[PDB]
Amino acid sequence: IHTILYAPNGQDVEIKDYEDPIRDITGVNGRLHVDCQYSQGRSSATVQY
Amino acid sequence: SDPEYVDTLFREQLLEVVMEGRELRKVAREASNVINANTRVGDVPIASDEEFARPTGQGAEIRDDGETYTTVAWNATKLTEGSRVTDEMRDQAMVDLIERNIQRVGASLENGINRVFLTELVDNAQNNHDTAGSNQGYQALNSAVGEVDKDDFRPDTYVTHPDYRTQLFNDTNLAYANRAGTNEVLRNREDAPIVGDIAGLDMHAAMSSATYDDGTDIGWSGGSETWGFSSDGDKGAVVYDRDNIHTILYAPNGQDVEIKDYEDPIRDITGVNGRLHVDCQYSQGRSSATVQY
Amino acid sequence: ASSTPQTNVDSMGGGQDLTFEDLRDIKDVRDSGGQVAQLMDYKALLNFGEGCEIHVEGDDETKQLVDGEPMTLSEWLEDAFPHLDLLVLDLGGDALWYPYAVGEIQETITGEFKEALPAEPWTLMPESDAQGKVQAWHQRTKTHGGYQTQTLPADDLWHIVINKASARDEVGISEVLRNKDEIQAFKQNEAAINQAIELHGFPQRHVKVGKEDGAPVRDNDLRRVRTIFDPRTTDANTAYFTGQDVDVETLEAHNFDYSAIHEMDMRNLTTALGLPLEAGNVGADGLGSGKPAELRFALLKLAIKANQRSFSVQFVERVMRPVVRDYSPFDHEADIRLEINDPLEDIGEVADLIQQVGDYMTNEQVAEKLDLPAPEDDEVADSYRSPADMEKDEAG
Amino acid sequence: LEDAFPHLDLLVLDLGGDALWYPYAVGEIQETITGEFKEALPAEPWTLMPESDAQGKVQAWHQRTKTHGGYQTQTLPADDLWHIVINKASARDEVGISEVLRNKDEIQAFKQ
Amino acid sequence: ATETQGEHTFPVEVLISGEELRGYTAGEALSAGEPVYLSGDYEVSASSADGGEFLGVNLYDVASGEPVALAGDDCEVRVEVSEQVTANDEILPDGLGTFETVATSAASAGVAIVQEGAASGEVCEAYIFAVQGTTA
Amino acid sequence: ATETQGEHTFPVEVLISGEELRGYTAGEALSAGEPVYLSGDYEVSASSADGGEFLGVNLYDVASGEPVALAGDDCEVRVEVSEQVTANDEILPDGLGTFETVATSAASAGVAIVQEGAASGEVCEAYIFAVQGTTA
Amino acid sequence: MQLRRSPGMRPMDRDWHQERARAREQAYSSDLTSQFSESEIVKYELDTAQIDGSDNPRTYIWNRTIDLFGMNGTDVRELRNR
Ligand SMILES: [K+]
Ligand SMILES: [K+]
Ligand SMILES: [Mg+2]
Ligand SMILES: [Mg+2]
Ligand SMILES: [Mg+2]
Ligand SMILES: [Mg+2]
Ligand SMILES: [Mg+2]
Ligand SMILES: [Mg+2]
Ligand SMILES: [Mg+2]
Ligand SMILES: [Mg+2]
């Protein structure tokens, strides 16, 4: 089971802290692109109630 | 940078100066008690007035009349001034536009402090001396000191309009060296040491005319009085205790005015912005008297 | 005669003067790297990178018990400033970049001398009196994106000016600001060459489709032709087959002499900054040898001497003497001198000189020229025959 | 003399350099508070110009300088100033020539 | 307006997105999330009902005469509604500190579009797209 | 639009706040502060007297065929009004290079709202909130 | 915000000075419409430059058809009695 992470620059979560000098505000933003896929879904079993 | 025109030697060059505009008088930091606040809102605690001890019978219970307290709140308002220019202007300007806009923004914040200070000082003084024309010179200053002394406070400072200064320096008490004990007012006018040492006051703070908030300026809602000394009912000087009027300055970074130059991340604009927060509050408004025309 | 200046000086900024914005321009030129920064870095290394030596005249006459132990003033100063080579290089570099180097004296908690500690020169600028002496220092610093600001008295700071406008000038000149236009002209032409190489330095394929005066070809048609001749999926030995109405034209690489423009730019900048052309990795035919070489290396060495003496005098007079006065048992009026070493002295040329005329030099003078400790025995130090000759003579 | 003029190598380069740029180098003599010799003090040569009599000798110096309040102006006697001229017009010239003003056209042609 | 988590009540962030935040003087005491309109020269007061009175929403609580920050057009905002609202409803000031739908009001055009629906008295999420002033 | 200080006349800075500025071609000569509208492909001309002709205000004086910087909606501007105006009034291009109120015009919807009142022939401050074109 | 073309900024533009200097030096009369583009008249505010041909050197330089005496190219404002 593969958690596929993508970042256009760097390698992981982008967290940006910036200040807007027009409004006197610090913004803190973050992003990541993520997908998750089995390579072999046969390699797992759910337990069902 | 890429200047479109080169500068040749021996000053055969273009005439490369800017003449200044009108500059307003800045005094509030010297003419009041300055509080550098830790918070943008806050309180100054005020103790109640002195009383008289109570006549009482022998062996009777002594009544309580303990000290009691209130506060004056400060609630500082962000004064701001900003400017934005395209990068083509910065490159092609006759002089440094960033330097000029920095100086303009700094001056606009100082003028802001002085407006807040003068408007509080004039509007909330609890005493008044009405000259009704007549003896408007030294006698008005002495009388205004009398009005504050009659409330059991002692003033030490006065703030003055240009029209009031003009009347005062025509006063025979000050204009004649015989009567003043010095010719300093006749020679050096407002720069005379006696002008800052008169009627028991030990500081003179000379204001501009435009400083008081008429409410004609954009973003400002006016004070209750007319600042001036030209016409019936104008208030043209305030005589007061400097330790009893507080200018509260708050800034989230450092102690004072914050100027930020910045470039727009998208559009080839550069700007400069200034912030400061200020409030002004009498601790004791009874310590102050206006002089009225 | 007078005991105060009766001649006035230009003073107190009544535009066309220094600002903290210009100080941060200098900071930006220094920290943005590349060729301009490396040239001014070489200028610092030539002037100050060869290290220093502290001299006192009559040093033996100073010999005193300092703290239960004997020292001379030279020995005390070498302990007061252990790493003076690094300080000289830092301050000397700063005083070339900026109008001044500037800093504090500091003390241990016990109050003994700690160090002379420089302050960041882009943060500070002076206020003078009318007679042009510095009375206060105004400091502004970025904290949390704004200029937190203070003022200091000129009492306990010190400052050094290599590039004076006049011998009375306590404010000085930045060689960066002096040559601001030459620096900008260099960076402009450098950017121009880099862009011109990308556009014009390489051939580019131009496929032209359709017959002249024939049927027109639309964008969606050119898309399919693009996939055939795509440079990104082409390989070195790809071959093409076409009808007559497809032309594989070429935008040639278009010749221009970027090497000559680089050489010209480097000549302009190096000469403006007072360096020889050779410091910019550029050579010239008529200049590499003979009297044409000897002149330019003479000029460079003279420029270094002038900067070194200007620095040495101020550092002794405005750092070392105050430190001797305030933290030392010695007389601060002593004949202290700070030598700064010659960066281009050939020891093999000095050896040739000693071999030729050593018969006229005391052994101490030889040891001084040859950069050695002077001999231990005063008579051998003072004498003119070599100590190896005195040893063989004494053995004989 | 070596103790009176300890930094003469610097003073010579400053004055000599000034006397190549400007028509003259010029300066004061100064005394310690006690009245012993302090230094020969160079003045800013672009601020000073000489007034001379009919025999060609300098009698006074006229100075003007920038201040916060604009230009300040004053006149000083030739008694307590001294001056040096490298570029004389004639052996009797005591005002001299600026090599820079003399070559103004050549300098402007180079710049152009 | 308020969010609950366990026993706790938290204030909601009125602003979801946008940079169109502007400064005015308050003409009266105002509460975060109230719609406001120009009562005077750079002075704003709480909007009355049925249109013609909207410049933006008040971003934080203020007393009369204090400077106030306001979110205008191009801002996504969390605002209280006086009736049930659904996505794609146009809404405008209710005259009661709330918003209501254009459909319920006497007006024919809104100032914000509801992006997430909400019940009466709840907080909806909406995007501000128009001001309204005195047209006569 | 101009301000007097002693002997001097100063031009007013047209744009108070905003980032919504764009480049067009002048379809005719225009003066700083004039309202303009689309008159050809990326070409702007001075707005006529009622609705349906407004994209923004011209920021600097131009001859015909020159590139024009324009301030659009989401901008606050200093603009001359041809009649007396008050805060909250919606205003509209006047056809004379000035603005006037929606109330005075033949139209019923404005393009900017007055934040700071002014007399006839005088500079108000206003926020541009809308554009108008050919609806038929 | 201010742009280099915006009316309050023109006096700070080096190019506005330099082009007004050119316009004064190249004109022969105050009739701008004949001598300059509408773009130049607007961009450089040429209505307000004191353009009249009095600063153009060709107003004063002699340019006769036949030149026996080397009179051509002499400028009257450089003579002894000027
Ligand atoms: K209703
Ligand atoms: K009409
Ligand atoms: Mg409180
Ligand atoms: Mg009892
Ligand atoms: Mg009581
Ligand atoms: Mg009373
Ligand atoms: Mg005087
Ligand atoms: Mg066909
Ligand atoms: Mg957005
Ligand atoms: Mg905005």
Q: How far is C-alpha B229 from the chain's CA centre? A: 17
C145-to-B102, B252, D107, E134 alpha-carbon distances in Å: 15, 11, 45, 42
Between strands B203-206 and B157-160, the pairing is parallel
Question: For tokens 């000073």, what's the residue?
Answer: D48
Cα(E23) to centroid of ligand 1, in Å? 29
In the sheet with E76-80, reading across from the earlier edge strand, the strands are E15-17, E76-80, E123-128, E112-116, E90-93, E99-101
Count of CB atoms situated within 10 Å of the CB of C174:
22
Number of H helices, E strands in chain F: 0, 13
What is the CB-side half-sphere exposure of residue C376 using CA atoms within 13 A?
0
Distance set, CA F75 to CA B218, C177, E79, F113 (Å)? 17, 39, 25, 11
Q: How many CB atoms lie within 10 A of CB D20?
A: 13
Length of chain D as a residue count: 112
Touch criterion met for G and C (3+ Cβ pairs within 8 Å): no
Alpha-carbon span C124 to C142, nearest angstrom: 12
Q: State how far residue G64 is from chain B, nearest Cα, in angstroms.
A: 32
Which of these, C145, F71, E76, F22, lies nearest to A20 by C-alpha position?
Answer: C145
Report the alpha-carbon distance of residue C91 to residue C99 in Å, rounded: 11
Interface check for B93 against chain C (CB to CB < 8 A): the answer is: no
Paired tokens of B114: 């002085």
d(CA G35, CA G30): 9
F90 burial (CB, 10 Å; 0-12 / 13-18 / 19+) is buried
| Token code pair at residue B17 | 């100066």
Contact present, B113 and B278 (Cβ < 8 Å): yes
The closest alpha carbon to G53, from G35, G29, G31, belongs to G29
For B80, nearest residue in chain E (alpha carbons): E23
CA dist B77 and B251 (Å) reads: 11
The pair of three-digit structure tokens given for residue B97, joined into one six-digit string: 């536009």
CA distance C18 to B205: 32
Instruction: State how far the Cα of B238 lies from the Cα of B215, in Å rounded to an integer.
Output: 20
Q: Measuring CA to CA, how many Å separate C368 from each of C309, C336, C373, C381?
A: 19, 17, 7, 11
User: d(Cα D85, Cα D89) in Å, to the nearest integer?
Assistant: 10
Q: In Å, how far is D4's CA from the nearest CA of chain B? A: 39
What is the full DSSP assignment across D53-100? -TTS-EEEEEEEEEETTEEEEEEEETTTEEEE-SS-SSTT-SS---HH
Q: Which residue, among B60, B71, B62, B100, has the nearest Cα to B83 in the 3D structure?
A: B100
SS3 C230: coil
Instruction: Please check whether residue D52 is in contact with residue D35, taking contact to mean a CB–CB distance below 8 angstroms.
Output: no
Q: How far from A36 is each of B21, B127, C254, CA to CA, in Å?
A: 66, 77, 51
Looking at the complex, does the CB of residue D66 fall below 8 Å from at least one CB of chain B?
Answer: no
C-alpha angle G70-G75-G78 in degrees, rounded to nearest 5: 115
DSSP β-ladder status, E21-26 and E43-46: parallel
**What's the 3-state SS for B82-128?**
EEEEEHHHHHHECCCHHHHHHHHHHHHHHHHHHHHHHHHHHHHCCEE
Set of chain B residues whose Cβ sits within 8 Å of the Cβ of C19: 96, 99
C-alpha B135/C-alpha D43 separation (Å) is 56
Q: Report DSSP letters for F25-38, one per residue.
A: EESS-B-TT-EEEE
List CB contacts (< 8 A) between E43 and chain B: 221
Is E38 within 8 Å of F88 (Cβ atoms)?
A: yes
Location of structure tokens 């089971």: A1
Q: How many residues does chain F have?
A: 136
Asked whether B79 and B109 are in contact (CB, 8 A), the reply is yes
Angle, helices C290-315 vs C84-97, to 10°: value is 110
Enumerate the β-bridge partners of residue C107. Answer: C113
- Strands in A1-49 per DSSP E: 2-6, 14-20, 25-31, 33-37
Distance of alpha carbon C383 from alpha carbon C374, whole angstroms? 12
Q: What is the DSSP string of B203-253?
A: EEEEPPSTTS--S-STT----SS-B-SSSTT-EEEEEE-GGGEEEEEE-SS
CA atoms of F133 and F39, how far apart (whole Å)? 10
CB-CB neighbours of G28 under 10 Å:
14
- Diameter of chain C by CA atoms? 112
Identify the CA nearest to C53 among candidates C378, C367, C358: C367
The beta-carbon neighbor of E25 closest among B75, B78, B221 is B221
Residue C2 CA to residue D45 CA, distance in Å, equals 19
Alpha helices in G1-82 (DSSP H): 14-26, 32-35, 38-43
Please give the Cα distance from B166 to B169 (Å, whole number): 5
Q: What is the DSSP string of B34-47?
A: EEE-SSSEEEEEEE
Q: What's the gap in Å between the CA of E69 and the closest CA on chain A?
A: 10
Ligand that lies nearest to the alpha carbon of residue E75, given by its number in the listed order = 9
Tokens of C139: 């400091």
Helices (H), chain C: 20-31, 34-48, 73-80, 84-97, 175-178, 180-200, 219-228, 258-272, 290-315, 321-327, 347-357, 363-369, 378-382, 387-395
Pair of tokens at residue B199: 């009627």
Cα–Cα distance measured from residue C221 to residue C223, given in angstroms and rounded to the nearest whole number? 5
Are C309 and D42 in contact (CB < 8 Å)? no
Burial class (CB in 10 A: 0-12, 13-18, 19+), F125: buried
What distance lies between CA B263 and its chain's CA centroid? Answer: 33
Among candidates E73, E104, E109, which has minimal Cα distance to F108?
A: E109
| Structure-determination technique | cryo-EM
- On whether any CB of chain C is under 8 Å from the CB of B95, the answer is yes
Q: What letter would DSSP give residue B198?
A: B
The neighbouring-strand residues paired with A25 are: A20
Report angle CA B157, B162, B165 to the nearest 5 degrees: 60
Return d(Cα B5, Cα G13) in angstroms, integer.
11
Ligand nearest to the CA of B82: 10
Ligand nearest to the CA of D69: 7
CB B244 within 8 A of CB B283: yes
- Record the tokens describing residue D110, joined without a space: 């180079």
Reference E22, options E45, E42, E52; nearest CA is E42
**How far lies B187's CA from each of B137, B143, B168, B190, B196, in Å?**
18, 26, 14, 9, 15
List, as one string, the DSSP characters of C155-183.
TSEEEE-SS-SSTT-SS---HHHHTHHHH
Residue C147, by phi and psi: left (phi above 0), alpha (psi -120 to 50) or beta?
beta
Of the candidates E9, G9, F90, the one whose C-alpha atom is nearest the C-alpha of residue B18 is G9
Listed resolution, Å: 2.7
The answer to whether residues B106 and B273 touch, using CB atoms and an 8 Å cutoff, is no
> Is F73 annotated as contributing to ligand binding?
yes
Ligand 7 centroid–CA B194 distance in Å is 14
Q: Is B114 annotated as a binding residue?
A: no
Determine if residue C274 is left, alpha or beta; phi over 0 gives left, psi from -120 to 50 gives alpha, anything else beta: left
**Inter-chain residue contact D68 with C168, CB threshold 8 Å:** no
User: What is the secondary structure of C16-78 as a DSSP string?
Assistant: -S--HHHHHHHHHHHHT-HHHHHHHHHHHHHHHTT-EEEEETTGGGG-EESSSSEE-HHHHHH
Please give the helix or strand (H or E) that residue D18 lies within, else none: helix D8-21
User: How many other C-beta atoms can be found within 10 angstroms of the C-beta atom of residue D99?
Assistant: 14
Q: How many CA atoms lie within 13 A of C179 on its CB side?
A: 19
Q: How far is CA G10 from the centre of its chain?
A: 18
Question: Is residue B269 helix, strand or coil?
Answer: strand
Could you tell me the sign of the dihedral formed by the alpha carbons of G40, G45, G51, G57, in that order?
A: negative
- Tell me the β-bridge partners of D41: D28
SS3 of residue E43 by DSSP: strand
By C-alpha distance, which of E70, E74, E79, E80 is closest to E36?
A: E70
G vs A contact (3+ beta-carbon pairs below 8 A):
no
For residue C71, the cross-strand partners are C64
Judged by its nearest atom, the ligand closest to the C-alpha of residue B66 is 5
Integer-rounded Cα Rg, in Å, for chain C is 32
DSSP strand pairing (B33-36 vs B245-250): parallel
CA distances from F18 to C272, E131, F21 (A): 44, 16, 8
How far is Cα D75 from Cα D58, in angstroms, rounded to an integer? 13
Q: Any chain F CB within 8 A of the CB of B22? A: yes
List the shell of residues around ion ligand 7, using CB closer than 5 Å: B 188
Rounded to the nearest angstrom, the minimum Cα separation between E89 and chain F is: 21
Task: Tell me how far apart the 2 most distant CA atoms of chain F are, in Å.
Answer: 49
3-class secondary structure, C195: helix
Give me E50's structure tokens: 């049925």
Distance between CA atoms of B89 and C288, rounded to whole angstroms?
A: 46
Q: Return contacts of G34-37, CB within 8 angstroms, 24+ apart.
A: G37/F63
Exposure string of C300-336, with b = 16+ CB inside 10 Å and e = fewer, is beeebebbbbbbbbbbbeebbeebbeebbebeeebeb
- Residue D70 sits at φ, ψ, to 5 deg, of 80, -155
How close does chain F come to E12, measured CA to CA in Å? 26
Type and span of the H or E element at D14: helix D8-21
With b for 16 or more beta-carbon neighbours within 10 A and e for fewer, the C160-172 pattern comes to bbbbeebbbbbbb
CA distances from C249 to C208, C234, C313 (A): 7, 16, 70
For residue C184 the two structure tokens come to 């900008």
Q: Do E21 and A23 touch (CB under 8 A)?
A: yes
Rounded to the nearest angstrom, the distance between the alpha carbon of F20 and the centre of ligand 10 is: 8
